[PDB]
């Protein structure tokens, strides 16, 4: 493929087949910008036993620093307004985003996603597993909600709110489902015509933020990054969210290796100590950029872990 640039081609690689190489090729987004950046390749490997007779919901969202968001519910049900998704961080979070709700941008200021994958590698033997895996994607964007509050001068509140989480409550005609033992592999893709830099947000530990009701936010349910010294919502990139629903009957022993990948381009702060690891985003690769979009529209919602 002697039309693609060295990096145009590494892009495609990191983008769609991370697990197929000894070490991650990814080397930045071959678009027009060629500013100073630091490409970070977050990987999370996790041994996990899906709780029996429950429906585990995993969300692979474009929230820098956190690998996935999980929650479980009574089998056959979906997250209700009372449900809270908890965050599972990729290694190195604090080293990257601090440990205070308002120190998110000490090291880095903005970021853009170049990749986001997930794979489930069943580990149970042929006599113990039972359940299925279902995947679907959803355009959840981070918008705002404006509502009058009854303070004294008498205000009007404008706060952050996730829009599109409503599509978590149902498996659409565009899904992948199959026996748990088969495992899965999936990728997300840029949900915008271009690849722009997203700003780092400050002080979001939970969404809806505290002292705002779910119902006010308009979110079907809520996401909590938890304690500020442990994790946080530092942003929300331009990728569709990947919904994974693991289902397991009682008596089943369903275990797997959860693996997540996310390649991103960060704008290093000259004061940050990760700066000297920086580089320039690579030059425009018209062919890679095109081939990216068509390959994207050509793949299935997901595939079994045997072809990954």
């Amino acid at each position: 493929l002697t039309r693609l640039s060295q990096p145009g081609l590494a892009f495609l690689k990191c983008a769609f087949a991370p697990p197929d190489f000894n070490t991650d090729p990814g080397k930045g987004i071959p678009d027009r910008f060629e500013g100073k950046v630091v490409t970070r390749k977050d990987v999370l490997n996790q041994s996990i036993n899906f709780t029996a007779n429950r429906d585990t919901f995993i969300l692979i969202a474009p929230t820098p620093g956190v690998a996935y968001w999980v929650a479980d519910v009574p089998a056959g049900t979906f997250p209700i307004s009372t449900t809270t998704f908890n965050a599972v961080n990729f290694p190195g979070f604090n080293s990257m985003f601090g440990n205070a709700a308002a120190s998110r941008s000490d090291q880095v200021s903005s970021f853009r996603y170049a990749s986001m994958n997930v794979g489930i590698y069943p580990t149970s033997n042929l006599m113990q597993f039972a359940g299925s895996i279902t995947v679907w994607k959803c355009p959840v964007k981070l918008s705002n909600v404006q509502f009058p509050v009854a303070t004294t001068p008498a205000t009007s509140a404008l706060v952050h709110t996730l829009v599109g989480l409503d599509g978590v409550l149902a498996v659409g005609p565009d899904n992948f489902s199959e026996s748990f033992i088969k495992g899965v592999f999936s990728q997300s893709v840029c949900n915008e015509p271009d690849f722009e830099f997203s700003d780092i947000l400050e002080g979001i530990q939970t969404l809806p933020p505290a002292n705002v009701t779910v119902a006010t936010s308009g979110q079907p349910f809520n996401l909590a990054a938890g304690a500020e010294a442990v994790s946080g919502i530092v942003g929300w990139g331009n990728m569709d969210t990947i919904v994974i629903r693991v289902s397991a009957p009682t008596g089943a022993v369903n275990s797997a290796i959860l693996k997540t990948w996310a390649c991103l381009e960060y704008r290093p702060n000259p004061n940050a100590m990760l700066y000297q690891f920086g580089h320039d985003s690579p030059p425009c690769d018209e062919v890679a950029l095109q081939e990216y979009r068509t390959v994207a529209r050509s793949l299935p919602v997901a595939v079994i872990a045997a072809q990954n």
Binding site: L1, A17, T294, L299, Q307
Partner: peptide
């Protein structure tokens, strides 16, 4: 196959 061997083929399709 493999995902890169699947991807590689797609690219070879519309590059041809």
């Amino acid at each position: 196959a493999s995902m890169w061997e699947r991807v590689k083929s797609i690219i070879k399709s519309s590059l041809a």
